Design a protein around this nucleic acid. Structure first.
Lengths: 29, 70
RNA sequence: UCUCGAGCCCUAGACAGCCGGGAGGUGAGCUUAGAAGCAGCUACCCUCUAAGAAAAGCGUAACAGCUUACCGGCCGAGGUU
């Protein structure tokens, strides 16, 4: 449950809002 | 293209050689404006987008030679 | 080779392998005719970024070149101490 993987998703979800697994993760959100 | 940093500093700095030990031995100083000009001479040699960042790169070789700022 | 225990990592993809990336300021400053990761001394900073040392090991007369770190992909289940 690394914190950096959590912070990453938030950073990705932040760009979409305006690793493949992490992208899919952000997208799924 | 444009000449290297190490030199562009030794010009407006008024000195030729650095210090045996950087940040420990301040050889010269540099007003913020002075660095605002150098950052302009190397607009192509740097990756940065804003002039702000371009400085950090330039302003990185200074304190590492004894080139304080004001 | 068998058996038992402890710590840590892992399907948000671990360990290994293979493929791709390993970038700019800048060949840091000093020393030096020259030294550019890698003779030595000192410092060891910031851009772009998913990464990428002021460079860990070879290599060079010095470059070059070959790789490590680091990141991404393929793969898919335990792995490591």
């Amino acid at each position: 449950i690394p914190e950096w993987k959590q912070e990453e998703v938030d950073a990705i979800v932040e760009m979409i809002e305006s690793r493949n697994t992490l992208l899919e993760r952000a997208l799924d959100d | 293209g444009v000449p290297p940093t190490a030199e562009l500093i030794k010009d407006e700095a008024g000195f030729e050689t650095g210090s045996g030990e950087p940040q420990e031995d301040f050889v010269a100083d540099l007003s913020v404006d002075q660095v605002k000009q150098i950052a302009e001479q190397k607009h192509p040699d740097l990756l940065s987008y804003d002039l702000t960042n371009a400085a950090k790169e330039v302003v990185g070789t200074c304190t590492s030679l004894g080139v304080t700022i004001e």
